[PDB]
Scaffold this active site. Structure first.
Site, mmCIF file in Angstrom:
data_model
loop_
_atom_site.group_PDB
_atom_site.id
_atom_site.type_symbol
_atom_site.label_atom_id
_atom_site.label_comp_id
_atom_site.label_asym_id
_atom_site.label_seq_id
_atom_site.Cartn_x
_atom_site.Cartn_y
_atom_site.Cartn_z
ATOM 1 N N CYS A 1 0.852 -1.186 0.000
ATOM 2 C CA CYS A 1 0.000 0.000 0.000
ATOM 3 C C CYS A 1 0.892 1.241 0.000
ATOM 4 C CB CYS A 1 -0.930 0.005 1.218
ATOM 5 S SG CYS A 1 -0.180 -0.443 2.806
ATOM 6 N N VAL B 1 1.733 -1.335 5.837
ATOM 7 C CA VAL B 1 1.484 -1.979 7.122
ATOM 8 C C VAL B 1 0.015 -1.988 7.561
ATOM 9 C CG1 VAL B 1 3.766 -1.143 7.746
ATOM 10 C CG2 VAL B 1 1.739 0.041 8.586
#
Lengths: 289, 294
Positions: free
Chosen positions: B228, B232
């Site tokens: 992303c 995380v």
């Protein structure tokens, strides 16, 4: 806290003397702190029910992050388990591997780890039995004819025995993968305690010897004793120092041991070994000739 | 310091009652578990990530990989951090290192990303962020804009097919080095805002996306690379959703706490927000699907 205390080699003589005053007062002060390092680092895989028969001493367990996990085609539980931990080295991370002495029941796992890691060097700092006490399985062949430990066979090409230590050239293989492994067994360890023996050089010759052969084991140098923390730890510290003293004019033994315990518990188990390391650090006398 | 193995396997038939209890007193218990989840791995080394030259390879200075589980680049370069890339192997429902959790590639670690993709033989990539969200930079458009082959260092990438859908996009690339050739599927979910979750309206959307990526999982040799922005929060809730999809299928219980607690010991901040931690539970009412189909 974060332990560290660099000392100039030109003042190391005075230093250890000041460390021993008042019945090793300062020494026990530093060591007592070393005992606190890493006390709250998970070792959950070590607590697993069916891994208990793989831990020699119920209380010397490998942290989860630094543990050397085995590669098996999945299944079961703790199938990747072996009481071993990567320990930083003077030259690179995971330079060493501190394991307990293999057990009749973790014997095959040991050779599996030697191969999967490409460790061409094993340093054994204890005899199988000492003072009528079992300390470590005799996980290697008693003769020259190859023995099959699980899927890995082991052939002892040669067995050289000396006065304080012993050397062995093994040749393990799996499928079509022959790999050599050198084996150095220090048998004259200064009891462990004490110490004394001005001949602490005997341990140093051994270290230098193993060290001058490290330039061959692409993989980590596997070191072990009984629990794999007391003598194993002292050894690693000495193999570090030996090099660090060579290239520097200061030594930080506290930091060293502190570093090691963050990777495996009890590394350098007794205040005696810890003081013994300083006794050995008189590697300066030699760096002055 | 932390010393308890977080875990709380809840029987699927008691899930409604369990999540109800966790939501009581303005999410009292959801917080107790989450605050402790936040303690995990805090004392795990990550020196590689602190080396002077790896600093520019970190998207964020506070999101680094643990040494033990980081992914290493292979190469002849004998210089500092040469094998570095902000990425960690994340255990699987099927196998350890089943996934690779990374940050969104930076303009300057871009070539490193593709190297990892080829060296790990990762034939699947799950990107849960838009390169840009609300005028804010989240991830480099590290891949081609056209069907024109693009050399990213020693690896040329050719975008074969591009499919822009409602809440997501699909892309099939063929990358190569010398003679080595590799097909790689890229699934980009664009309806998941950073530090957030899909909308209550995208509830079905995201779960369908996870389904779609699960069906393809088998076609990849290496670990599925999912990422992303910081790699995380959204990356952590995804990996969890993928697990549970499989686990829920073959089992009669879930242990979200153990799952998240697990992930977080391989890479920090996995499932960053308490809201995402709860989102996972809402999703676990995947049993709805279960209880129906059959």
């Amino acid at each position: 806290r974060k332990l560290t205390n660099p000392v100039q080699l030109d003042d190391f003589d005075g230093y250890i003397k000041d460390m021993a005053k008042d019945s090793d007062y300062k020494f026990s002060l530093q060591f007592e702190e070393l005992k606190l390092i890493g006390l709250d680092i998970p070792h959950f895989a070590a607590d697993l029910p069916m891994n208990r028969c793989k831990n020699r001493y119920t209380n010397i367990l490998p942290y989860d992050f630094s543990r050397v996990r085995l590669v098996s085609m999945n299944e079961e539980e703790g199938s990747d388990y072996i009481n071993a931990n990567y320990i930083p080295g003077y030259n690179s991370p995971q330079e060493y591997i501190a394991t307990q002495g293999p057990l009749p029941e973790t014997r095959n796992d040991f050779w599996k780890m030697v191969l999967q890691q490409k460790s061409q060097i094993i340093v054994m700092l204890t005899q199988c039995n000492e003072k009528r006490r079992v300390k470590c399985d005799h996980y290697w062949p008693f003769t020259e004819d190859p023995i099959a430990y699980g899927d890995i066979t082991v052939e002892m090409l040669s067995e050289e025995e000396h006065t304080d230590w012993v050397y062995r050239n093994f040749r393990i293989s799996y499928a079509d993968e022959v790999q050599d492994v050198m084996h150095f067994n220090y048998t004259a360890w200064p009891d462990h305690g004490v110490p004394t023996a001005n001949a602490a050089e005997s341990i140093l010759q051994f270290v230098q010897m193993v060290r001058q052969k490290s330039v061959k084991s692409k993989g980590p140098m596997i070191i072990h004793c009984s629990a794999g923390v007391g003598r194993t730890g002292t050894f690693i510290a000495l193999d570090w120092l030996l090099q660090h003293i060579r290239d520097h004019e200061f030594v930080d033994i506290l930091g060293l041991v502190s570093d090691m315990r963050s990777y495996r518990m009890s590394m350098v188990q007794t205040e005696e070994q810890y003081i013994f390391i300083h006794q050995c650090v008189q590697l300066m006398w030699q760096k002055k000739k």
